[PDB]
Amino acid sequence: KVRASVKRICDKCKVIRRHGRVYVICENPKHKQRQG
Amino acid sequence: MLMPRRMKYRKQQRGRLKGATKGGDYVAFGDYGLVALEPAWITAQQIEAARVAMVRHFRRGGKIFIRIFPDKPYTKKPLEVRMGKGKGNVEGYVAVVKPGRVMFEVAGVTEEQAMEALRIAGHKLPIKTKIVRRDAYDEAQ
Amino acid sequence: YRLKAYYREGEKPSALRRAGKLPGVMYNRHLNRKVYVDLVEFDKVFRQASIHHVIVLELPDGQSLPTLVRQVNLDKRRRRPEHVDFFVLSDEPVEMYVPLRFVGTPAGVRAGGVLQEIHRDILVKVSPRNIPEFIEVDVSGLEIGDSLHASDLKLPPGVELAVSPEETIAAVVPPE
Amino acid sequence: AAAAAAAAAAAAAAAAAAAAAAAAAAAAAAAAAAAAAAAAAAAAAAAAAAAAAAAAAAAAAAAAAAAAAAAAAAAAAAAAAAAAAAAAAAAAAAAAAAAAAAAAAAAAAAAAAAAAAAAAAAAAAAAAAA
RNA sequence: UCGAUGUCGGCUCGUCGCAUCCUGGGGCUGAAGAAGGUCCCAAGGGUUGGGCUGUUCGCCCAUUAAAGCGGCACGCGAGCU
RNA sequence: UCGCCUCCUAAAAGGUAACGGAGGCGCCCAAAGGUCCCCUCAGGCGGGACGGAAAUCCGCCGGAGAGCGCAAGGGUAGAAG
RNA sequence: GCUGACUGGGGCCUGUAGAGCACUGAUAGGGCUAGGGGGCCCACCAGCCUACCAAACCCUGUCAAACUCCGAAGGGUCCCAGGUGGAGCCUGGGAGUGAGGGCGCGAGCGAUAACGUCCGCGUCCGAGCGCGGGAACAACCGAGACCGCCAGCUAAGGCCCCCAAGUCUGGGCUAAGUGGUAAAGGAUGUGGCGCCGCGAAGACAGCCAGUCGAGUGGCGCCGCGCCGAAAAUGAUCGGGGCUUAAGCCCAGCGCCGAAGCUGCGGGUCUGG
Numbered sequence A: 001k002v003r004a005s006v007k008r009i010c011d012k013c014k015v016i017r018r019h020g021r022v023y024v025i026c027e028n029p030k031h032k033q034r035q036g
Numbered sequence B: 001m002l003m004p005r006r007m008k009y010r011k012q013q014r015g016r017l018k019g020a021t022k023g024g025d026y027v028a029f030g031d032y033g034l035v036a037l038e039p040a041w042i043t044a045q046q047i048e049a050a051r052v053a054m055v056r057h058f059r060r061g062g063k064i065f066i067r068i069f070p071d072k073p074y075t076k077k078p079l080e081v082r083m084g085k086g087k088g089n090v091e092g093y094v095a096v097v098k099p100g101r102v103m104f105e106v107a108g109v110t111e112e113q114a115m116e117a118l119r120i121a122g123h124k125l126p127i128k129t130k131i132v133r134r135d136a137y138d139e140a141q
Numbered sequence C: 001y002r003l004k005a006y007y008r009e010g011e012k013p014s015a016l017r018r019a020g021k022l023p024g025v026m027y028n029r030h031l032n033r034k035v036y037v038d039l040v041e042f043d044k045v046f047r048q049a050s051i052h053h054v055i056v057l058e059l060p061d062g063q064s065l066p067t068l069v070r071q072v073n074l075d076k077r078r079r080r081p082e083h084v085d086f087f088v089l090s091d092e093p094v095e096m097y098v099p100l101r102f103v104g105t106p107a108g109v110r111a112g113g114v115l116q117e118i119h120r121d122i123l124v125k126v127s128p129r130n131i132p133e134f135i136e137v138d139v140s141g142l143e144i145g146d147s148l149h150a151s152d153l154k155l156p157p158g159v160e161l162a163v164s165p166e167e168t169i170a171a172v173v174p175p176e
Numbered sequence D: 001a002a003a004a005a006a007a008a009a010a011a012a013a014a015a016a017a018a019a020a021a022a023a024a025a026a027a028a029a030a031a032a033a034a035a036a037a038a039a040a041a042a043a044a045a046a047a048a049a050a051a052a053a054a055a056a057a058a059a060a061a062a063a064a065a066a067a068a069a070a071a072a073a074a075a076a077a078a079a080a081a082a083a084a085a086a087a088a089a090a091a092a093a094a095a096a097a098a099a100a101a102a103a104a105a106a107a108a109a110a111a112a113a114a115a116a117a118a119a120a121a122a123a124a125a126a127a128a129a130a
Numbered sequence E: 001u002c003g004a005u006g007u008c009g010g011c012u013c014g015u016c017g018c019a020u021c022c023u024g025g026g027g028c029u030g031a032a033g034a035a036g037g038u039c040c041c042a043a044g045g046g047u048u049g050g051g052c053u054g055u056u057c058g059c060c061c062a063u064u065a066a067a068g069c070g071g072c073a074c075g076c077g078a079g080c081u
Numbered sequence F: 001u002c003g004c005c006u007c008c009u010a011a012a013a014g015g016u017a018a019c020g021g022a023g024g025c026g027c028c029c030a031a032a033g034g035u036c037c038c039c040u041c042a043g044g045c046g047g048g049a050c051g052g053a054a055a056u057c058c059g060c061c062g063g064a065g066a067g068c069g070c071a072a073g074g075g076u077a078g079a080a081g
Numbered sequence G: 001g002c003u004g005a006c007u008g009g010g011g012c013c014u015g016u017a018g019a020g021c022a023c024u025g026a027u028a029g030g031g032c033u034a035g036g037g038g039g040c041c042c043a044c045c046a047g048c049c050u051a052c053c054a055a056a057c058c059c060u061g062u063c064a065a066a067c068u069c070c071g072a073a074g075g076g077u078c079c080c081a082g083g084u085g086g087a088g089c090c091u092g093g094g095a096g097u098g099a100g101g102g103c104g105c106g107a108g109c110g111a112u113a114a115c116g117u118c119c120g121c122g123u124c125c126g127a128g129c130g131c132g133g134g135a136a137c138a139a140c141c142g143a144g145a146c147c148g149c150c151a152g153c154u155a156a157g158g159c160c161c162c163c164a165a166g167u168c169u170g171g172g173c174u175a176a177g178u179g180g181u182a183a184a185g186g187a188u189g190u191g192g193c194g195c196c197g198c199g200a201a202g203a204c205a206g207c208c209a210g211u212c213g214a215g216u217g218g219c220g221c222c223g224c225g226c227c228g229a230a231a232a233u234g235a236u237c238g239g240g241g242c243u244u245a246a247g248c249c250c251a252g253c254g255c256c257g258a259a260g261c262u263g264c265g266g267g268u269c270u271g272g
Helices: B045-058 B111-124 C013-018 C039-047 D122-126
Strands: A015-016 A021-025 A033-035 B032-036 B042-045 B072-076 B088-097 B102-107 B129-134 C003-007 C019-027 C032-038 C056-060 C064-075 C080-088 C094-101 C121-126
Touching: A015 C032, B032 B111, B042 C039, B045 B102, B045 B111, B072 C019, B102 C080, B111 B129, C003 C039, C013 C019, C019 C039, C032 C039, C039 C080, C056 C080
Parallel strands: C003 C056, C019 C080
Antiparallel strands: A015 A021, A021 A033, B032 B102, B032 B129, B042 B088, B072 B088, C003 C032, C019 C032, C056 C064, C064 C080, C094 C121
């Protein structure tokens, strides 16, 4: 979730900048990360 | 842990870090290096930690070459004490490292495993690192 | 293996470097000249030729000198070549290194061990008109115990062993 | 585009000399497909049959390789098929139209058929091969 | 600062910070429900009465939605003790 | 801890501080002094009854790593031994 | 009475920076290998083996204030030149000081902490809290204030308003108010240079692979920005307010600007 190192965790996961912030979204929600 | 077997002198002065590496700057053994990008004292505990991670990664696998060696003693006064009363006690040992020193090296491994292993180690080190290959590092004739 | 060289007069090496050029010199018993080459083109070459194989330098007077490298000095930080030494050959026999062919793989595998190419190449006396491409080794029964050293080689014509010859060349050793 | 060298010698050297081909249409093959027509389909013509659409995609340029002038009618398609540059075939013409009638549902349609200097059209191969 | 800057804690009076103990949002959950865990946003308001020790703090009793942690010269003696 | 000597710190003249690093001195020799004349070390490899891994003997190899009362440094066999 | 600092040329003296491993030690990997441990295995004492401890020797790699085969820049000194300076040398009278401080560089101590502490070379404050810049501010930048001027030229630093002088010119970046002060580390944020994959053997991404008809991927250099970033009275880059800038990088022209320099008058002290 909220960490200073966001990386891709798997190949379904996906890195998305939205509104100033770097997120990540996978298919499975455990993989969801936001940078902070 | 990782220290000399003898020293001529038990404690020694801190000194400084002029640029460059002097030597130990090109590959020489294995097929992939981890190189220094900044000067620092690297402590035996760090060297060891990195080294172990390397192996742990390609578990019991290829070969490893530790190219820096902590000969320098690291003093430190007891806790809570004031100044004076001679130099402090020796706590550990460091290896003086300066940009372009090839600190590690690996052999008998895939580039994938290697790339990765090293990266990992670079994390355990308190300085910035780069990975290397085997270019014009062949000082011959 | 050819490289456009140029003639260096007295332009600060710094500025040449700055401008992607690689300062240098060429010499032999007879000639001595400041030269420069371009970096990326030299590297393209050297990446293969290195000190093992001849390079032909094309000066601005059309002439084409057959040379070997004798030295690549480099800046520790920003690990790049600062300066190249070129030895222009002629006919007198000259010393150099010649690459080896580590055939197959060694039999030391059960104990986790791994090969050590202690010598990828060997020093030899040769004439410029009889330069070999390579030398052929025979690695197969290199176990976790034994190794090989000396004149256990397939020395062709034009060659003279300019080593010990008693000296270790490739040894298989335990894992990390 | 390094790949065109081992190719631009064999759609006017292979696709130019033959004797007896025809057209089928293997299309929507679901889980029943792996690579077994480049691994057992030779049993139709000895050392001959295969599985490819090579020069069956820019076939406006393959209808200029064996000299055939005026090029706009068929040629492309999922042209699966199998004949050969040196192989025999004749007696399957009555068995032919059984794989589009009910053994499948429609998908054994044809387009061309080079009967050694005798190309057959659509119903001109469906009435001919009967 | 020694031709003086009263120097623990208690009381009284507050005010601020958020790294939030309740209360309001929310995402993950090894989230069935209920109840947790964990992180994210959020101080607006709240954050008890006793036994023991000068105590700070702490342990304990009975509660509680909760019984937060800090700064203000270890806030506050020309306000008291 | 307090005087004296050696080394480093001391930034290539000299000098250079700290409760910086690390050692010595408060003696000794009637020959360990003067001069003249001789002689050359430590090791290493052989080889030799008692004989260790150096007792004394022989032969090669050995520019100095021996030795110069004692700390260190400098010096030194073309001798200071 | 020209000998001074400083400078030029010549000649000595030197063991740091750097570098090096020849000595003194430390040290990685490999080979060879005295001993020793230990397996084979026996007392007839030999003998074979060891991905064990381990001298010397060999190959390849390193480290050092109290190591040096080597060694700068500089420094000290004598000679001979320049050098008339609030220089020097000599004899005597009068002192105050003997508590330093910061900054830069070089070391030690310290924790490669401190407006720390101890020396060394330099510099300023001290005594220049007089003047200009830096928002304010002994010692950072500029510059050594005898007095006067409603004159002029510059210094640092400045030219959108406060506030003197450019909303000056030409080319780029940046979209965070970054600028307007933080790290490991993260990211399909941007821009600019590089070099390879491999594309009518027309799948890079999308529905059965045919259609689809092209650009796709992977590294490497460089610039600017994003998150990483939580503390206590009311905030804020000095403030207003700045977005092809009033930010940042690169070019250039002009102006502003001190008690610096000139001009003009005056005073005083020295020498002529």
